[PDB]
Amino acid sequence: GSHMSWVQLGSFKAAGTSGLILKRCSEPERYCLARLMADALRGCVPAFHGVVERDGESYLQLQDLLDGFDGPCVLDCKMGVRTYLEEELTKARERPKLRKDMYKKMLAVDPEAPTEEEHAQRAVTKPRYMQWREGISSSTTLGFRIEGIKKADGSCSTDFKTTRSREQVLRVFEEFVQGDEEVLRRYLNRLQQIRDTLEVSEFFRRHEVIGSSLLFVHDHCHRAGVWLIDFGKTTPLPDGQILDHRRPWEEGNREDGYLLGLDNLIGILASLAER
Ligand SMILES: Nc1ncnc2c1ncn2[C@@H]1O[C@H](COP(=O)(O)OP(=O)(O)OP(=O)(O)O)[C@@H](O)[C@H]1O
Ligand SMILES: O=P(O)(O)O[C@H]1O[C@H](CO)[C@@H](OP(=O)(O)O)[C@H](OP(=O)(O)O)[C@H]1O
Ligand SMILES: [Mn+2]
Ligand SMILES: [Mn+2]
């Protein structure tokens, strides 16, 4: 139906127009969505209708991806081997911003994870925190991680911070599709067509794609869709430089492993379909 409906039962506000949603405007994301509407990836991302003012503040006017579905099931998959910008590494060296909450989260998952100095600081840098999150999840090894699942009743989970092995990820998707062969086949067809689009996209070869997700949406009528969302940390490469999006990240090469992630994700869903 609508995302704001699920919200009722952060950055998102109800739109005036049926089948639209408002997302708080960020300059990187507005730049990306404008380019994407003119790119091969146009159909792989939510429709971007421009910017509107509400309570004297700027919102992206977006397609509500849940609008076509009857009681949608949603899964958010964060794509990439790296989940922070390289500029965040520089700032953390020259001008660190210590984070006490991020320290507490770590203790909880692994008490021996923080160093003697982080313990004494009771705090860590964001990039250190994001690197640790990448290693305890599937991000480092598979190039994606499950962030959360939602359902139209209000029922939601984000309890995936240690979902890491290929088989752990497969078991989350197995539970998400609840044995619906038609939804799984449609998800796999959509991912195959997205991969093909990414591999020819002018936008994609010219941009570092960090912190974006693939949003999986399906319903009990067997409707299934997948879209790329969240371009808040997607930045152009300089001087017409390009990425392959599969090779390992090494500080300075700005590689995101996005397609390593999509290759693995397709392989897991193809595996699930043969079980
Ligand atoms: N166009 C859309 N239509 C419907 N639901 C959407 C849309 N975009 C995002 N959502 C929902 O909102 C969630 C958050 O989206 P997104 O990642 O863009 O926002 P964010 O505020 O940057 O979140 P985060 O910091 O968790 O990445 C998605 O996982 C999905 O449930
Ligand atoms: O544990 P979760 O909720 O996934 O949060 C973490 O992951 C978010 C992205 O999903 C980060 O956001 P961003 O890097 O801006 O995309 C967030 O960072 P911050 O605390 O807002 O500075 C970080 O604490
Ligand atoms: Mn996001
Ligand atoms: Mn964001």
Task: Tell me the technique behind this structure.
Answer: X-ray
Question: In terms of domains, do 219 and 179 share one?
Answer: yes
- Ligand 1 and 62: CB distance under 6 A: yes
CATH number assigned to the domain comprising residue 201: 3.30.470.160
Ramachandran region, residue 153 (left: φ > 0; alpha: ψ -120 to 50; beta: rest): alpha
Range of the domain at 116: 87-137
Question: In terms of domains, do 257 and 210 share one?
Answer: yes
Query: What's the CA-to-centroid distance between 120 and ligand 3, angstroms?
Result: 32
Question: In terms of domains, do 112 and 224 share one?
Answer: no
Q: State whether residue 40 is helix, strand or coil.
A: helix
Question: In terms of domains, do 70 and 176 share one?
Answer: yes
Please tell me the distance from the alpha carbon of residue 126 to that of residue 118, in angstroms, as a whole number: 12
Residues, beta carbon < 5 Å, ion ligand 4: 230, 232
Question: In terms of domains, do 24 and 117 share one?
Answer: no
Resolution (A): 1.7
Question: In terms of domains, do 76 and 173 share one?
Answer: yes
The last residues before gaps in the chain (C-N over 2.5 Å) are: 9
Question: In terms of domains, do 52 and 132 share one?
Answer: no
Question: In terms of domains, do 109 and 199 share one?
Answer: no
Question: In terms of domains, do 176 and 221 share one?
Answer: yes
Comparing CA positions, the residue from 118, 121, 127, 124 lying closest to residue 90 is 127
Question: In terms of domains, do 158 and 56 share one?
Answer: yes
Please tell me the distance from the alpha carbon of residue 5 to that of residue 23, in angstroms, as a whole number: 15
Comparing CA positions, the residue from 153, 182, 179, 184 lying closest to residue 73 is 153
- Ligand 1 and 265: CB distance under 6 A: no
Question: In terms of domains, do 71 and 178 share one?
Answer: yes
Given 95, 117, 137, the domain boundary residue is 137
125 touches 92 (CB < 8 A) = yes
Number of separate domains in the chain: 2
DSSP summary character for residue 17: S
Question: In terms of domains, do 200 and 268 share one?
Answer: yes
